[PDB]
Amino acid sequence: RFLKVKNWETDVVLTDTLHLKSTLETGCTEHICMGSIMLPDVRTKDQLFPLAKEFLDQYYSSIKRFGSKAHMDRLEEVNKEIESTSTYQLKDTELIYGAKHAWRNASRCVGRIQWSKLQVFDARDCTTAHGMFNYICNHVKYATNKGNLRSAITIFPQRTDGKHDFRVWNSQLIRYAGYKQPDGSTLGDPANVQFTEICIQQGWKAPRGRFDVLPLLLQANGNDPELFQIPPELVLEVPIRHPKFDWFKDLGLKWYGLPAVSNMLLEIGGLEFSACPFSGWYMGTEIGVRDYCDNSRYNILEEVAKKMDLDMRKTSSLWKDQALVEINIAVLYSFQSDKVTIVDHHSATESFIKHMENEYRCRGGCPADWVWIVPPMSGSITPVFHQEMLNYRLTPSFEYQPDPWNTHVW
Amino acid sequence: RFLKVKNWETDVVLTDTLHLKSTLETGCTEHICMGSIMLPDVRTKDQLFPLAKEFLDQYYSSIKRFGSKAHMDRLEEVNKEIESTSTYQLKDTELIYGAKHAWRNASRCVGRIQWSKLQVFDARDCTTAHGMFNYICNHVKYATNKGNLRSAITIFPQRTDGKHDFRVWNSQLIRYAGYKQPDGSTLGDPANVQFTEICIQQGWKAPRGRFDVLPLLLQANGNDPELFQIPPELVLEVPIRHPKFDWFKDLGLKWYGLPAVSNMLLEIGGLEFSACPFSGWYMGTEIGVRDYCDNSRYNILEEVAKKMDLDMRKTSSLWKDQALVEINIAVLYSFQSDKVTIVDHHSATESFIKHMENEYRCRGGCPADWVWIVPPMSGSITPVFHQEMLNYRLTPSFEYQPDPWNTHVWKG
Numbered sequence: 120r121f122l123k124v125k126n127w128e129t130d131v132v133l134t135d136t137l138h139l140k141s142t143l144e145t146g147c148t149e150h151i152c153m154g155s156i157m158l159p160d161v162r163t164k165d166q167l168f169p170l171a172k173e174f175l176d177q178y179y180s181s182i183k184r185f186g187s188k189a190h191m192d193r194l195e196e197v198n199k200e201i202e203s204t205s206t207y208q209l210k211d212t213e214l215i216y217g218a219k220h221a222w223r224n225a226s227r228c229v230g231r232i233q234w235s236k237l238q239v240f241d242a243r244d245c246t247t248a249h250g251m252f253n254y255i256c257n258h259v260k261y262a263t264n265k266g267n268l269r270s271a272i273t274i275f276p277q278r279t280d281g282k283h284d285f286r287v288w289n290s291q292l293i294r295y296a297g298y299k300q301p302d303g304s305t306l307g308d309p310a311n312v313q314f315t316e317i318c319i320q321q322g323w324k325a326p327r328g329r330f331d332v333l334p335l336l337l338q339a340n341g342n343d344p345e346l347f348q349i350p351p352e353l354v355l356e357v358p359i360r361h362p363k364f365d366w367f368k369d370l371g372l373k374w375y376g377l378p379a380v381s382n383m384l385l386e387i388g389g390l391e392f393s394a395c396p397f398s399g400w401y402m403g404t405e406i407g408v409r410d411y412c413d414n415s416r417y418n419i420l421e422e423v424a425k426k427m428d429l430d431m432r433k434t435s436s437l438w439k440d441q442a443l444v445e446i447n448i449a450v451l452y453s454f455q456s457d458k459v460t461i462v463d464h465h466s467a468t469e470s471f472i473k474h475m476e477n478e479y480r481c482r483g484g485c486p487a488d489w490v491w492i493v494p495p496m497s498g499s500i501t502p503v504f505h506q507e508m509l510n511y512r513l514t515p516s517f518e519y520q521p522d523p524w525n526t527h528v529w
Numbered sequence: 530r531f532l533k534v535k536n537w538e539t540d541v542v543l544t545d546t547l548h549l550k551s552t553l554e555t556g557c558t559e560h561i562c563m564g565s566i567m568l569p570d571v572r573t574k575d576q577l578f579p580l581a582k583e584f585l586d587q588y589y590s591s592i593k594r595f596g597s598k599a600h601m602d603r604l605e606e607v608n609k610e611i612e613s614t615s616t617y618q619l620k621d622t623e624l625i626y627g628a629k630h631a632w633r634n635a636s637r638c639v640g641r642i643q644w645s646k647l648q649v650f651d652a653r654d655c656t657t658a659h660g661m662f663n664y665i666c667n668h669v670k671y672a673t674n675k676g677n678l679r680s681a682i683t684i685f686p687q688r689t690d691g692k693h694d695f696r697v698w699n700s701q702l703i704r705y706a707g708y709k710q711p712d713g714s715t716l717g718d719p720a721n722v723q724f725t726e727i728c729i730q731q732g733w734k735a736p737r738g739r740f741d742v743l744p745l746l747l748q749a750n751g752n753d754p755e756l757f758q759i760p761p762e763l764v765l766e767v768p769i770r771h772p773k774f775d776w777f778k779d780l781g782l783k784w785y786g787l788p789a790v791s792n793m794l795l796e797i798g799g800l801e802f803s804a805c806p807f808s809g810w811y812m813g814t815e816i817g818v819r820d821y822c823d824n825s826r827y828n829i830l831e832e833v834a835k836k837m838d839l840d841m842r843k844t845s846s847l848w849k850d851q852a853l854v855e856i857n858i859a860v861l862y863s864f865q866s867d868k869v870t871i872v873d874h875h876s877a878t879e880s881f882i883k884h885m886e887n888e889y890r891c892r893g894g895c896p897a898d899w900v901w902i903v904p905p906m907s908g909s910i911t912p913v914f915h916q917e918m919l920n921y922r923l924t925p926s927f928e929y930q931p932d933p934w935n936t937h938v939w940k941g
């Protein structure tokens with residue numbers, strides 16, 4: 120019931136008490152662990168008030184006013200609002216606190232040392248897709264900040280009866296198009312082929328290139344989604360070169376500087392924000408290991424290894440491993456030379472261990488999903504590999520939601 | 530019931546039914562996942578007979594004799610043995626099937642494609658530490674096979690009252706001593722410092738070098754353990770050199786060829802085999818990533834990166850990653866050049882995925898601990914990184930057991 124986590128490199132043992140406030144289900148049972156599974160009608164008046172109360176209690180606790188008149192008055196006001204309206208509205212202070220805590224609670228996020236420095240853009244007054252587009256360009260410009268990136272979230276209106284959802288159809292605000300070719304191969308990012316098809320069939324004129332920034336497909340008020348191109352000048356991109364290999368730049372590789380997740384659902388005090396795009400800055404391996412080297416992505420290992428003239432005849436020469444490191448050296452070098460914030464996996468995981476220690480010391484724990492927190496390369500030479508982590512679900516939370524094209528009816 | 534697992538690289542979806550045979554608990558609940566926690570007297574008659582029966586039913590199904598007279602007779606014979614003597618003895622065939630299935634069921638093992646090829650040495654007639662020493666020598670020689678490694682396991686007598694346990698005190702049959710210096714540094718393997726001090730206290734004469742093979746410390750029949758030195762001609766070692774870098778040999782690195790886990794408990798049909806040393810062959814990353822490059826182990830990253838003249842002033846040059854790959858190239862090269870079996874992490878994971886898919890078709894599942902199956906370098910360029918896995922506990926099994934110096938009743 121009171122749980123210990125041990126770091127096997129340092130022998131430091133921490134005691135987790137925060138997990139007892141967990142609520143949602145993990146997917147695990149006593150008989151089966153689903154730790155490696157990626158994915159393991161709106162709230163009635165009955166379900167919503169426990170959720171609001173739970174949230175407001177933690178809020179008033181945080182501002183050291185638990186059980187105060189102002190605490191009791193707010194519970195009163197919200198209770199009244201729910202019974203009479205079937206939902207309620209967060210105060211600005213509550214929305215800011217809830218958004219920061221959703222990030223603080225994100226068990227899969229290695230960058231949470233930053234959780235309290237988050238710029239919240241309140242877009243609850245938005246009513247159209249054009250409005251959404253404006254809010255998103257401003258988010259993009261603010262976060263990008265000419266390369267000196269700033270964490271931000273933009274929060275559109277909450278779910279009502281669920282027939283009027285706000286949704287950004289894109290999985291991220293900035294992503295490259297994917298096209299299936301007569302050749303049989305794939306040009307661009309293979310992960311975006313389906314979305315790119317939905318874009319073309321809504322009218323987008325695809326440049327039909329390798330690195331075409333996709334248009335936004337925005338849905339306001341449960342309406343059919345609409346297409347907008349982000350002003351090209353707001354999308355900061357980085358050409359990829361290597362500090363030692365001249366030929367590298369000739370591969371013709373670039374990536375964008377702003378990672379911005381746009382398909383998640385923010386839950387605060389039982390209220391659901393179906394469109395809540397947020398952004399920070401990249402850890403280099405995301406681009407260099409996953410984006411460039413996954414077999415189902417840009418898949419460039421073979422090409423790089425060839426230009427390095429490594430022995431590709433046997434897996435045991437570790438040619439994939441050598442080329443992997445070089446590609447990751449190139450990503451980091453290129454972002455650093457163009458002064459676009461990026462963090463390496465050594466530095467990011469070191470920060471997260473320090474963050475974990477703060478969260479144990481100050482909050483009684485830190486939910487963490489080791490499968491996602493340990494970087495996709497050089498696992499055991501980062502300190503997080505040796506750190507036991509307990510994974511549990513706290514609210515406010517970010518939750519994955521299914522692609523809306525499955526859900527939506529035109 | 531059915532549980533689905535997806536591979537996110539191939540879109541292959543598999544269906545697990547075998548998890549319905551899982552009995553033991555995981556450490557996880559609906560509210561907490563303990564998937565990255567490393568560790569998440571006798572049995573009574575009434576808890577033993579169900580376990581025996583479950584096991585014998587599985588054994589007789591495997592041989593296509595479920596429900597036979599031979600099957601029913603063995604159940605009755607075991608029943609009678611338990612009620613009379615409070616335990617029972619496995620037949621040789623059952624012991625062999627049991628030992629192979631514990632490996633098959635080992636969810637943290639990437640090498641399981643090989644499970645049915647395992648040489649079982651029945652050491653249940655052993656009575657003394659000297660007898661244990663002889664059995665272990667024969668195991669080392671057989672398994673080593675002059676570099677052509679063969680999987681093997683030696684099984685000493687089972688637990689009785691838990692006061693007469695056979696135990697191998699070494700965590701592996703072959704490992705290097707560690708010595709803490711007064712200045713706080715470590716000579717040799719820092720992981721083995723405490724064990725090394727026990728051996729010394731037991732009267733081992735320590736050479737005090739960087740790669741001193743530890744003596745065996747063997748406990749028979751709950752007696753105080755006894756020290757034995759493995760004959761050096763039985764310990765195959767590989768000097769580590771690099772195919773391109775001629776300075777690599779002068780780091781003075783070597784490693785032993787035979788990885789042989791000696792501290793685990795084997796459970797078959799509710800019987801507990803507290804000494805059951807087993808061995809296979811290394812995956813290169815075990816030595817090159819963990820043994821050499823963990824900060825709490827030989828910790829050679831700095832010295833290697835120094836000699837490679839890497840830019841070491843900022844982590845973002847990825848100097849550690851670069852040095853790491855070259856050390857692992859060296860390990861695989863050296864083992865291969867000396868014709869000592871080893872497998873790289875690409876080939877091992879690819880084989881494991883084929884094994885896992887086969888197991889799903891023929892068995893209805895393959896419990897797998899992703900946290901351990903994914904290699905400690907280059908994780909996402911191996912196919913296991915992208916494979917969803919279900920972790921659950923089947924018996925027969927291997928279990929961790931606490932180190933014996935904590936629990937042992939010294940007789941003097």
Ligand code: HEM
Pocket residue numbers: 222225227228229230231233237270271272380383397398399400401402405462467491517519
């Ligand atoms: C400041 C820089 C940040 C860094 C370096 C960072 C790092 C990361 C990384 C490496 C992942 C794994 C994602 C993947 O492999 O696809 C991740 C996941 C995640 N992070 Fe962060 N993060 C940052 C900012 C943020 C912010 C600002 C938020 C929320 C406001 C956030 C919330 C999340 C969530 C919800 C996930 C899981 C995403 C999913 O399930 O797809 N992070 N983080």
Ligand code: HEM
Pocket residue numbers: 628632635637638639640641643647680681682793807808809810811812815872877901927929
């Ligand atoms: C034949 C070649 C084999 C290879 C390449 C191999 C590979 C591995 C590796 C890399 C691990 C993780 C070990 C670690 O990180 O410390 C492991 C774990 C394990 N394997 Fe194997 N294995 C092999 C044979 C065997 C055999 C013969 C058995 C038993 C009969 C076995 C049973 C186990 C068990 C019980 C674990 C978990 C160990 C623990 O909890 O400390 N494996 N295997």
Ligand SMILES: Cc1cc(N)nc(C[C@@H]2CNC[C@@H]2OCCNCC(F)(F)c2cccc(Cl)c2)c1
Pocket residue numbers: 157158291378379380397398399400401402405519
């Ligand atoms: C099935 C599925 C479930 C979940 N929960 N997430 C995904 C998304 C999958 C999981 N890894 C790849 C893909 O992520 C794309 C977004 N990556 C993070 C980032 F690049 F956007 C990023 C990076 C740093 C900081 C921030 Cl704010 C954002 C898929």
Ligand SMILES: Cc1cc(N)nc(C[C@@H]2CNC[C@@H]2OCCNCC(F)(F)c2cccc(Cl)c2)c1
Pocket residue numbers: 567568640701788789790807808809810811812815929
């Ligand atoms: C706390 C704790 C719990 C558990 N279950 N295991 C350990 C042992 C921990 C787990 N990783 C480090 C240490 O293993 C050292 C032995 N490595 C395996 C091998 F080298 F012996 C090996 C390799 C390949 C094949 C075989 Cl048969 C054997 C520690």
Ligand SMILES: C[C@H](O)[C@H](O)[C@H]1CNc2nc(N)[nH]c(=O)c2N1
Pocket residue numbers: 154155156157490491492537914915916917918
């Ligand atoms: C099946 C497995 O859970 C899946 O491949 C995970 C593993 N760890 C990950 N870790 C991160 N950060 N991002 C991912 O997309 C994944 N994918």
Ligand SMILES: C[C@H](O)[C@H](O)[C@H]1CNc2nc(N)[nH]c(=O)c2N1
Pocket residue numbers: 127504505506507508564565566567900901902
């Ligand atoms: C805390 C964490 O569970 C621990 O460091 C694990 C991670 N994965 C591992 N995987 C293997 N193969 N061997 C290990 O020792 C570990 N250690």
Ligand SMILES: [Zn+2]
Pocket residue numbers: 147151152153154557561562563564
């Ligand atoms: Zn679990």
